[model samples]
Target: VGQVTGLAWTEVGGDLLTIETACVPGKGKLTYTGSLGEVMQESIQAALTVVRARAEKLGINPDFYEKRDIHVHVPEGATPKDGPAAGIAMCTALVSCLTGNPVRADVAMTGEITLRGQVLPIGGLKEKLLAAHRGGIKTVLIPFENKRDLEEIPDNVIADLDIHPVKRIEEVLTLALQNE
Candidate 1:
């Protein structure tokens, strides 16, 4: 996928959300060119809300969405991709966009993000991690609840990764952002 933000975060090394955004001088809106599925579209919406709520703390104009529109696309625009595991990726990209920060390209993560900034658990831990390993991901941030599933992942993959079981969005943000 082409790099947009000089900051990229891969999702299980698959659903990679590169930092891509646009500024339109009008009503704020988020458009997706990659044909996001219902669930993932929801994830993006939730991410925007989280960003809006934390705009001040993130050093961004609280009303950015009102004056600046942003377009976020998951590369390969034609692919029909959907899943709840993209919550963390959505928040990651939004945070980068608002804070003028770059995320480490090699850092990949997966989890559900709630409206209140809670990081929830996800499925396919072994599958996602294996895919991440193949994609050369070195650091992984999984939901704290996924600890037990860690055992199902092979030792080889586990040993090679910098695994971190995180309980909240702040933890993920701390580990994902490069300038943090």
Candidate 2:
């Protein structure tokens, strides 16, 4: 599979969104060009919190954030959006930046992250998965707590994609890259 990377988050408890960025240099400043809501902004901060705390373990330079500021413009910037679900997406994006490893373009994920690196489950798994599929994502990483919800997923839907349910943040790293 090609190296695919994208950011996933939920807005207003219902709308799940994913932001896809590429590793193209000289692309000018990183832009959060789309319309993003307040919660989304907060989610970015939350993701950063855990990512910074675990930079060493993740083999990333702790000071990396000091050198670059991510410009996050949510799509449909005109629309007001809010929710904490994007925390994991934000962290993944930052990791992608530090590692120069593009997030799997065919994958999308969502969850609220704690400072201690815990990934809390969010609502709307079915809709979010549908959204991911609609956006052309082939795989999805969801919080372990949400595993029970998988039963709600139809066999046809599950057959069409790879769904990995995880607990800790480290688990995400493995599924994110090809070699593991």
Candidate 3:
């Protein structure tokens, strides 16, 4: 995302994955500058819905949707990114914006989302992990359903990350949020 927090929200993560999320009181419009493609736009829509669906459990205002014009973009300008792989990332970005919390810089995530917040597996597991590795990510979140994919990664590479195979958005949130 270009920049989300005008409220002094710090940029978390970096290029291609650097999420900029911001909020302000206004009619809700989920605007994303990065070329998310049509399929990934639904990913953001699903993310925003789940954020509201689970907001009470998340301990955030249920009214955030009606109250804020949330803007999110992945600053991979001119390079459109898409897929269900960003499901968890989008959810985390929106939640981070709503709550003024920061995402852990060392962490990266990928998965598909549902209205109930289940995290689903995606393709290119090895490539994704390798990209996160190259990006200096120390922690990675993937769907628990993809746990078997871990076997494909060399032990040496696996040893390099603090991996969390998650089943739900709640679990994603627990590890993704930077502790105050």
Candidate 4:
């Protein structure tokens, strides 16, 4: 398969995945398409936890996710998925759903989340960022610790896209929601 911009954790391991959902107006049912794994499922849970905790700070309704049964699924159903690296992406997706603010299709992010709402760094910085760029991502939200790795990347590699390294979940909001 071709390289996908979004990198997520699944029950089996780290893999490139895409998320898509559908909702029927009259049916009031949300359906998740594609196959997903334990890690992706747990990542959605963690994303919800962070979003609910910071809804007030983000100026969003705290009960947003509560109103809808979100169906999150990772593509490539045949392959098993597993990992914690997708915590931040999952949170971003949930936030997008709750606030009705569509995620920038050209942007992608990856990181782990702490219960306190911190976005921890993950492995494969250069590889992941390269993947994002190759997949046509124009902006990327990365863990703050990975900033140091930026020095190692060729300036030309990141020249086209905006890379925002953040420490807390709140920082992600600033990078993701604020107009540049």
Candidate 5:
């Protein structure tokens, strides 16, 4: 359940990046895999803090991190990856795991995040949207500031998917997490 499909803009093209996380009984030790680069590792840390910063309000155990070890892994360990754009997806995956809520498989997302959980615009918006369309994503969550970049994407791509421009993590949680 702790999985979210995040978009990535690669040199080859845009690709579907999956973020997977798990919480197991142990001392609070945060770990990750998939050969993430320095920036992405820092991004994961940022996401962790964002989740912890709002734990009580989000209905999560205040000391959840103290008791359970968290693992955040991206697939395709063979491929080196780095970016702050997946911050929201990482946050969502962690929250999903801790809350027992499943993220919508049909949804994909991309956006940098502030320590305060604000969603920020990313580069390669066109390529990312293209990847979402090619991956058959039903709904995509992008930073609200990137709305203007939509005009650069092809009409067919835009028309094929439901695009949501989000300004904060709350909106992402509302749209990406399933109640049942």
Candidate 6:
């Protein structure tokens, strides 16, 4: 249940990327699977930092990372992935894992995250939104900076999707996390 959907833009087109995270009893160890490039690796680190910084606010153990081994994986695809766009999704996955709250399946996100939880803009806004719509994502979380780019998307596509322009990771978590 510790899963979140992230939108990734490839040369072919934008696709939905599933990020799964789990916590096990062990020392502070973070493992990443699913062949990731250096950029994506750094993105994970940034996401972890953001999550750890907000541990208290998120109702997670303040030293959760130090007490539990965390595993983060991108499932089903072995292709080397690289991008900062999944940062917000990664953070959401980590929080969901630690808090035992399953992320909403109908929601997906694309945004780079800052240490202070700000959602940074990413490229391929049009392709990402199209992919989200194609992937049957009812709600989409995109960087606030990308709001203007939505005008380029078709009216039908825009009408079919519930897109929310977010300025920070807080908003993404609020919308992506399930109430139960």
TM-score of 5: 0.96
Q: Which candidate is the best by TM-score?
A: 5
Lowest summed lDDT across 10 adjacent residues in model 6 is found at 8-17
Per-residue lDDT of model 3, residues 1-180, tens digit only: 222211001123322366677787888776777665677778889989898888887777998777779887766555656667777888888887787787777788878888888998887677677667777778888889889999998776798878889999889878888742
Instruction: Compare the candidates by lDDT and give the number of the best one.
Output: 5
Q: What is the lDDT of residue 177 in candidate 1?
A: 81
TM-score of 2: 0.78
TM per prediction: 0.87, 0.78, 0.87, 0.75, 0.96, 0.94
Stretches of candidate 6 off by over 4 Å are: 11-14
lDDT per residue as tens, model 2, 1-180? 212233344334335464544323342344454566677667767776787788898787666665555565455455455666667776776677666766665877777788777888987788777776666778888888989898898777777778888787788767776433
RMSD of each: 3.8, 4.2, 5.5, 4.8, 1.4, 1.5
For model 4, residues 117-149, the per-residue Cα lDDT tens digits are: 898888777767776767777888888898888
Q: Residue-wise lDDT of candidate 1 within 87-120, one digit each (tens)?
A: 7777877777666787787788888889898888
Which residue segments of model 3 deviate by more than 4 Å?
1-16
Give the 10-residue window scoring lowest on summed lDDT in candidate 4.
21-30
Displacement of residue 174 (Cα, Å) in model 4 is: 2.6
TM-score of 4: 0.75
Error of 2 at 125 (Å): 1.0
lDDT of 6 by residue, 1-180 (tens): 579889874433356787888898889999998777777889999999998888998998998878999999986556667889999999999999999898987899999999999999998888888888888898999999998899899998899888999998888888999852
Show where candidate 4 strays beyond 4 Å: 1-5, 9-16, 21-37, 58-66, 152-155, 178-180
